Each structure stands twice: as C-alpha cells, then as structure tokens.
C-alpha cells in the first residue's frame, strides 16, 4: 500500500489535487477567521484587492522558489542548452502556479472578497434614491452599507440588489479566469510539443536521467565522505571507526586536536 | 484482494463508473453550495448557461489533457499508421467524453440549472394576468420569481406552472442527450469494428503490447540512466556507489567537480 | 514509516512548517490568556511594543542558543575559511529567524496587539466631537475606550473606524514585511549561490562531509574513552 502511495506521489495529478485541496482549506479558514470586511469610507477597495492578489503572489513565489530545479536553471543561466533549460523550468511551472490559481478561483467563487473590494465602484445613476446632490454622503453610505450597516430604512432592498449584481459579476469573472487559464495551459503544452527538440521518447528519458543522476550522486557523495572520514579517524585515534580497537590506541597529544580543526 | 482490485482497474467499466460517481457527487455539492440562483433581470441566462456548459467543457478538456498518449498522437499527426493513430484517439475518446456527458445529464435531470437559466425566455400569452403594456415590469417579475421571490400574491400558481414547464423541458433534453450520445457511441464503436484492419482479438493483444513496451521502455531508460550515472561515479571517485568502497579513495581535486558539471 | 519520518526530518521545510504551526497555536492561546488589552492611560504603548517585538526576538535568542554551529563560528572568528563561515551562518540564519516573522505576522494580522499599542497615537482631527481644548480628558478617554470601555455615549462610531483603520494598516504592514522577507530571502539565497566557490553539487558534498564528519568522530571519541576505562578497571581491580 505504501508502494502504491509512492507511485501516486510520482504522478503529479495527486500532488496538484492535494495542493488545490490545501489551498481551498486555507482559503475557507482564513475567510472564516480574519476577514471582518471593514467599511473604511476612504480606503476599502485596497483591502479586498490586497486580500485577493497578495496571497496569490505569496503562493506563486513559494511554489516557484521551493523547487531546486529553478535554482539550477538560474545558476546555469547566470541552442540545445537554452531549449533544455527552458523545458526544465516549464516542467514544474504548472505545479508552481496551481496553488495561486486555485486560491483565486475559490475566492472569486465565494465572492465575499469581490463584494468587500468592488462595493465602492458600484453605479448610482440608475437609482434615483442615491442622487445625494451633496456629492459627499453618497460615497460614505456606498462604502459603509456593505460592511455591517444594515439600517433598514427603505434602503436595504436597494443595497441587496447591488450585492446580487456584484455576486453575479464575481462569478462570471472567476469562470472567465478559469477558462482563460485552461486555454493558456493548452497552448503552453503546444509550445512544449512544438519548441521541444526532444522526440516523444527523449523527454521522459532525460527527466529520469536527471533525477536518477542527482540521487545516485548525492548517495555516492555521502558514502565517499563517510569513507574519507573513517580513514581520517583511523589515522587520528589509531583505530577504524565501526571496528574493534582491542589492538592499538593512539592516545593523542594536545597538539593533535588542532590538526583536524582545518575543516 | 489487491490483485483483484488491480484486475478491476484494468477493466474500463469500473473506472468509468468511479468517474461518473465522482462527477455526480461533485455536481451535487457544487449545486448545493455555490449556485444561489441569482435574480439578475438583465442577464440571468448567462449564469445558467455558464453553470450548465462551461464545467462540461472543462471536464472534457481535462479528460483529453491528462492522458499522456494524446500528446504522442498529436505529434504523430503533426495508411495503416493513420488508422492506428485514429483508433487510439477513438479509444481515449471514450474516457475523455464519459465525464462531461454525465455532468450534462445530471444537471439537466436535476433541472435547477435549467430553471434558473431560461426563465426570462418564458411566454406570458397563456396567462392574461401578465399583461404589462409597459413592457418593462414583466421581464422584472419573470426573472424575479424563479430564484427566491415567491411573492404570495395570487401569482405563485402561474410561477409554479412555469417552473414545471421548464423542468419538463429540461428533463427531455437530458434524456434526448443521453439517447443521442448512446446512438453515437454505438455507431462510433461500429466504425472502430469496420475501418480498423486488425481483428477482434488482434486489437486487444496490440493494446497490451503497447502498454507493456511503454512501461518496459520507461523502466529500461531509468535503469540505463542509473548504469550510466554509476559508471560516471566509478570513473570519478574510483568506486561503485552503494558498494564496499574500503579499497581505494580518489580524493578528487577542485577541477574534477567541473567535469561532472557538463550534464 | 519511522525511516520516512527521519527522512522528512532531514528536510528543513518540515521543521520551519512545524515551528510556524506551534507559534501560531501558542500565540492564539496566549493572546486570550493574559493579554486583556491593558488599559493604561499613561504608558500603554510599552505593553503593546513589548508584546509585539520581545516574544519574537526571544525565540531568535532561543534559535541561536540551540545550535552549536554558531559556537564554532564565533570561536574561529574571535579567505576560504571565513567565506565558508558566512555560508554556514546563512544556512543557520534561515532557520534561526523563521519563527519571529511568523509570530510578527500573526500578531499584527490579528490586530488586537497594535490597537492596544498605538491607540494613544490616533488623531482626533477627523472627529469634531473630540475637541477637548483642555487636552487632558481627550487622552484619558483615547486610552480608555479601546481596552474594555464600550462607553455608550454616541462615540462608539469613533472606536470602530479607529479599530478598522488600525486593522487595515496592520494587515498592510505584515504583508509588506512578509514580501520584504521573501525578497530578502531570495537575494540572500542569490548571494549564497554566487559568492560561494562551491558549485550547485559541490556545496552539497561539502555539507554532507561536514555532517558525516561530526558523527563519525563523536562516536569514535566515545569508543576511545570507554576502551580506556576498560583497561583502567583492569589495572584497578584486575577484571575486564
């Protein structure tokens, strides 16, 4: 069963599904805990805009920076080589961006961020009751009603309508984004199937070679380091580490301790 | 028991059933959670049309995309080889298209999406109460009643009738779609049994051979990568990785690290 | 399963993730335990400033004190050898300062710590009711309402906008600080990949030799002493 789990982990689909589920759970928890939807007459679009965009950027940067392949590509950058580097960087791009896109889609489907962000940009020319010739009380009431100011004074029905409109609009935006995202993915794959010098068989072989070579290199490096130090300690204390030392003991002097202090 | 499960996964019927069940459950949860049937008088058909059609296309594109053999088929397309490629694409088409039709059928049979979609397209000539010489309040009430505005003012009966009518139509579409798909499926499979050059038994063996050579080629490529990498270590450090390397220690110089930097 | 856990422990991503989780869990208990938003008219910013900075920097001292690599760095520091110390400091630094930024972000996004800290710095110019030309009662009530004083005197509208304005400014600061920390982590990560004489693979080899070298010497040092006592007892009473 553990081997089956590891095989599923090898496949990316389960990993992206788990990442999306974690992002959904985090969005629901954050919305339940700390939204509070303030009415700040002056600065309220910025609150929702930050809560919508910034978490997406943190997810993007965390996803891209956490992969050492992007570091290796940047180090190589800092022909065939350019194409393989571009393909290698693009390979993990989908897993990098799957989290912020899920975040954005869930937030737009919920619509509360869009409601507390785009309320001050609502239209009042259609409503004669929202004339407010003073040109001042209109914006304060516009910013203050969506938050907690019910004020059942023959206004709530009107405000209810606007909320619905935004909600409807919110949904559309989310839907549109998803569609575009999908299209982008397809065209990206098209590039991966048009600009790739590798044939239908060379890509998987190359990726397996890179992964296998990194794994065997790290294991061999660890083994060689351990072996070099068994020899260093054998010279040092007169006996091999991990062996029986009933034969000889060095009994080192004080000056010897500084010798192994070079590294 | 696990072998029996692995046998069942080989069967396509159990997989198609699991996919259908997951789609039905997801549709139920999505409809119960994030539908809300908006009452936008101006644009209410757009919401229902999107919720009815767009997820089907997203599931369809996913069903095509996550299948690895699609990219190979497109690359070959980008005689008998053409027939084989077309037959492989037809074979994957069944799993690609099983899910969106299940989504469409379930949504149409439930009826709520269709009720909230084509409400404003209803006819009022049957009911003399919806006179509305002004030609404005009629669309308002028509798009308002279906979602949440019961308004028990001796109009609900008419609203009820309208709902039933729409529901009935919705049901028909679903069944018609089912029927249509079924007939298509039939003739589609018939084509696969007429245009294909291989016999009934030759096709199953040929598909099994394809899967076996693909898996064995991938494993052999990974193993060859491992043999090459290990050869590079025995050349560089002078020992075989993962073996008793107590014999000799190379201690390579600074320049030797740049040698393994080529790939 | 235990081997899998040990392999995960070998990875610092789980250590940072767990440390942040316990800091958040400890913070939520502690914020509701003995915080109370103390109502000091005179000097209440000190309580807020203390709770905002001191608990975070204490874990910095804990992180430095709990790691012995810095001890070798300071001993040698009190060329290639100096350059390697900087990389060793850089790696320890990332795990050293991860906890306070988690604490700083959580408290400041909570909002209650900064409302009870910079309440006295709020401006009453927007509010015509808080004229108070005597300049004495204005600061008394300003430090009074946010702590526990509801004060149903048709002035509560003042405290929500003060709270909401404080809450909004609090969120922007942490998200900017988180972004600034991420950029700082990126550029320092870039400096460590450029000024380091080691390659992308040689650095892993050198670190692997270091970690393998401490354990092998330490276990051999343990064997060397035990073996010497065994003769000492043989010379002492005559048995082995």
């Amino acid at each position: 069963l553990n081997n089956i789990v590891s095989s599923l982990q090898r496949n990316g689909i389960f990993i992206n599904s788990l990442i999306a589920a974690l992002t959904i759970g985090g969005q629901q928890l954050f919305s339940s805990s700390t939204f509070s939807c303030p009415c700040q007459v002056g600065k309220n679009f910025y609150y929702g805009s930050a809560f919508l965009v910034i978490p997406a950027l943190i997810l993007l940067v965390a996803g891209f920076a956490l992969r050492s392949q992007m570091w290796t590509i940047t180090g190589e950058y800092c022909p065939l080589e350019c194409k393989l580097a571009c393909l290698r960087f693009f390979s993990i791009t989908g897993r990098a961006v799957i989290a912020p896109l899920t975040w954005l889609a869930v937030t737009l489907l919920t619509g509360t961020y869009y409601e507390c962000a785009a309320s001050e940009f609502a239209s009042v020319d259609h409503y004669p009751m929202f004339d407010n010739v003073s040109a001042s009380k209109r914006e304060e009431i516009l910013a203050g009603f969506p938050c907690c100011r019910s004020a059942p004074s023959d206004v709530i029905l009107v405000r209810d309508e606007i909320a619905l409109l935004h909600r409807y609009q919110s949904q559309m935006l989310g839907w549109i984004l998803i569609t575009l995202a999908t299209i982008a993915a397809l065209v990206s794959c098209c590039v991966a199937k048009c600009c790739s010098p590798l044939t239908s068989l060379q890509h998987c072989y190359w990726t397996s070679h890179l992964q296998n070579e990194r794994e065997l290199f790290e294991q061999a490096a660890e083994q060689h380091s351990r072996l070099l130090m068994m020899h260093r300690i054998k010279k040092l204390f007169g006996f091999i580490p991990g062996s029986e030392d009933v034969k000889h003991i060095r009994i080192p002097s004080c000056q010897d301790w500084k010798d192994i202090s070079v590294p | 028991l696990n072998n029996i499960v692995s046998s069942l996964q080989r069967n396509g019927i159990f997989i198609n059933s699991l996919i259908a069940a997951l789609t039905i459950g997801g549709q139920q949860l999505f409809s119960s959670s994030t539908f809300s049937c908006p009452c936008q008088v101006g644009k209410n058909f757009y919401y229902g049309s999107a919720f009815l059609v767009i997820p089907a296309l997203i599931l369809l594109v996913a069903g095509f995309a996550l299948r690895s053999q699609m990219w190979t088929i497109t690359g070959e397309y980008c005689p008998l080889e053409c027939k084989l490629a077309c037959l492989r694409f037809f074979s994957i088409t069944g799993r690609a298209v099983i899910a969106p039709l299940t989504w469409l059928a379930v949504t149409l049979l439930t009826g709520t999406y269709y009720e909230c979609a084509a409400s404003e397209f209803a006819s009022v000539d049957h009911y003399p109460m919806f006179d509305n010489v002004s030609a404005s309040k009629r669309e308002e009430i028509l798009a308002g009643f279906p979602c949440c505005r019961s308004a028990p003012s001796d109009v609900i009966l008419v609203r009820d009738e309208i709902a039933l009518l729409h529901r009935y139509q919705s049901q028909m579409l679903g069944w018609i779609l089912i029927t249509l798909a079924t007939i298509a499926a039939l003739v589609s499979c018939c084509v696969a049994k007429c245009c294909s050059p291989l016999t009934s038994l030759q096709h199953c063996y040929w598909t099994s051979h394809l899967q076996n050579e693909r898996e064995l080629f991938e494993q052999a490529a990974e193993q060859h990568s491992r043999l090459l990498m290990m050869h590079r270590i025995k050349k560089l450090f002078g020992f075989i990785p993962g073996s008793e390397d107590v014999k000799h220690i190379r201690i390579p110089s600074c320049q030797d690290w740049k040698d393994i930097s080529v790939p | 399963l235990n081997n899998i856990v040990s392999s995960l422990q070998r990875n610092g991503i789980f250590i940072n993730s767990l440390i942040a989780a316990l800091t958040i869990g400890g913070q939520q208990l502690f914020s509701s335990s003995t915080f109370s938003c103390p109502c000091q008219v005179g000097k209440n910013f000190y309580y807020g400033s203390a709770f905002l900075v001191i608990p975070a920097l204490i874990l910095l001292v804990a992180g430095f004190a709990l790691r012995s690599q810095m001890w070798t760095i300071t001993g040698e520091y009190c060329p290639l050898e100096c350059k390697l110390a900087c990389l060793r400091f850089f790696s320890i630094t990332g795990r050293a300062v991860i906890a306070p930024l988690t604490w700083l972000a959580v408290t400041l996004l909570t909002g209650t710590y900064y409302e009870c800290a910079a309440s006295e710095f709020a401006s009453v110019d927007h509010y015509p009711m808080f004229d108070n030309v005597s300049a004495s009662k204005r600061e008394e009530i300003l430090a009074g309402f946010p702590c526990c004083r509801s004060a149903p005197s048709d002035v509560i509208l003042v405290r929500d906008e003060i709270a909401l304005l404080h809450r909004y400014q609090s969120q922007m600061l942490g998200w900017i600080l988180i972004t600034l920390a991420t950029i700082a982590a990126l550029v320092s990560c870039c400096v460590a990949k450029c000024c380091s004489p080691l390659t992308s693979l040689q650095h892993c080899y050198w670190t692997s030799h270091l970690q393998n070298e401490r354990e092998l010497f330490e276990q051999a040092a343990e064997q060397h002493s035990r073996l010497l006592m065994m003769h000492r007892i043989k010379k002492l009473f005559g048995f082995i």
């Binding site: - | 039933l164 029927t179 499979c189 038994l201 099994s208 076996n212 | -």
Partner: protein, 282 residues
C-alpha cells in the same frame, strides 16, 4: 453458476437505480400532451439505452460484425445468448416501472374518461376536463376532488401493474420457448453442448492469460534487443526463461481464428472452435 452471478447483479442494480430515479428525479408535468410524453420517455428511453449498452459490452456481437464484414444455427445461439445477457437490463427496468405504477399513471392520466368514474355524478367542466384530470398525479388538486382523484389514481395504477405482470408472463413463456427451440433444433446433444460451452469459456480464459503473458515477454525481448539488458522481476525473468519467443503470427492465421463457428468436424473427431479448427487443421 457464473451466469446467475452476472444476471443477479444486473437485475438488482437496475431495480436500485429505478428506485433511486423515482425518489430523486421524477416529476409529472401535470398538463395535457406533456405528461404522456414524459411518462412514455420514463420507461422506453431508459430501457433503450440499456439495450444498446448491453449489446456494446458483449464480446460476441463485434465478432459477428467482423464475420459479416469478411462475408443459421450459429446465429441462433448468439442471438439467444446476447439478448439473454443484454435484454435482461431493459426488461427488469421495464417491469419495475410498470409494477411501481408511477410512470403509467403519469402518462395515461390525460386520456381518462371523465364520465367513466363512479361513486358520484360526473363533475367535470367541458373545457377544463383534461386539465383537471392531468393534474391528478401531482396531488395538487383541491381536496374537494379527492373523492374522484382516488378512483382515477388507483384505476390507472391497476392497469400499470396488470401490464407489468403480463409482460413477465410473456417473457417467461418466450424464455421457455427459446430454451426448447435451442435444444430441439440443435444438431448436437445437450450433454455435448454443455461441454462445448465449457470449452469456449476455458479457451478464452487461457487465451487471455497467455496473450497478456506473451505480450509482456515479447515486449521484454524488444527491450533486450534495443538496450542489451532487461530489468525484470523474478516472475517476469522466469516467463521468458520458460517461454521461448514463437514470433509473429501470419496475418491469415489471426484471420483464421476469428469469425463465427459452424461446428464443422474433421472425420469424426469434433472441433469446437476456430482455434481448435486451426490447431487440428495444421
């Protein structure tokens, strides 16, 4: 036997789906010329889909198509076999729907004769006669008409279940007649026919198992030819070690083992399949 295991699951599953379908998705569009079509589409359409589906999953139909593309008694067996395994699903759905009675009263409520009711004088308007009757199944009619509604809602329910039992009686007779015709018109005795059916099941079980094994061995050999080595487990490494590679069968030979069987015997000794005909022929 194994047939009852497959038929029992299909028969039970259709009833479960029908019960689920009726409680979650079934609403009579109570209005003339609408519920009749809805009720008819609630029986025939689900049955037709199962009938087409049952054909597609059957392996023997595609074998029949291939033989006809390359082109009595052999056709009698398959049609008695494919329908016996594919027409089960529509029939069970059809009978449960009729026995339940929801769909039929949903359909024929429009055509109820207002003057055919009893227990009171006929009370129906000249213009809204069908409109009132069509609304009976929805149970939305006023309680003043519940005296008349119960008679109609139970008369058509009687007609639904009566048709459900007569369909079972017709089907049961046909299955008996098919069994008699299959045995009586067959050229071989039923003891040999039972042996013939056992051989076909055994051949396909071994043929499928060998073909999968042969493909893996053939694929493994190609890996050795292409790479010079194979990474196989103990069982796979044994399989090639015990199974030498026969090679590629000629195109006619695969065509020789496909098609329909007429039970042609070669000088006394019977041959029960095309593969047995090919193996004994050469």
């Amino acid at each position: 036997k194994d047939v009852m295991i497959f038929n029992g699951l299909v028969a039970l599953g259709t009833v479960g789906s029908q019960e689920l379908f009726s409680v979650v998705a079934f609403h009579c569009p109570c209005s003339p010329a609408r519920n009749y079509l809805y009720g008819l589409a609630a029986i025939g359409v689900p049955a037709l889909v199962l009938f087409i589906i049952g054909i597609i999953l059957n392996n023997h139909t595609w074998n029949l198509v291939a033989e006809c593309q390359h082109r009595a008694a052999p056709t009698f067996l398959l049609l008695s076999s494919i329908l016996g395994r594919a027409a089960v699903a529509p029939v069970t759905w059809s009978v449960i729907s009729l026995l339940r009675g929801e769909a039929y009263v949903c359909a024929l409520s429009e055509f109820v004769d207002p003057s055919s009711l009893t227990a009171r004088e006929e009370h129906f308007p000249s213009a809204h006669a069908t409109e009132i009757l069509a609304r009976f199944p929805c149970k939305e009619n006023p309680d003043n008409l519940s005296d008349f509604r119960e008679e109609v809602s139970r008369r058509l329910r009687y007609e639904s279940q009566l048709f459900g039992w007569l369909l079972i009686g017709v089907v049961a007779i046909l299955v008996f007649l098919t069994k008699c015709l299959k045995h009586y018109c067959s050229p071989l005795s039923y003891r040999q026919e039972a042996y013939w059916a056992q051989y076909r099941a055994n051949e396909d079980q071994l043929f499928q198992r060998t073909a999968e094994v042969h493909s893996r061995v053939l694929a493994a050999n190609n890996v050795r030819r292409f790479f010079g080595f194979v990474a196989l487990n103990k069982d796979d490494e044994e399989l090639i070690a015990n199974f030498p590679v026969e090679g590629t069968q000629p195109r006619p030979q695969w065509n020789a083992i496909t098609g329909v069987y007429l039970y042609r015997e070669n000088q006394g000794l019977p041959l029960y399949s095309r593969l047995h005909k090919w193996a004994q022929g050469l």
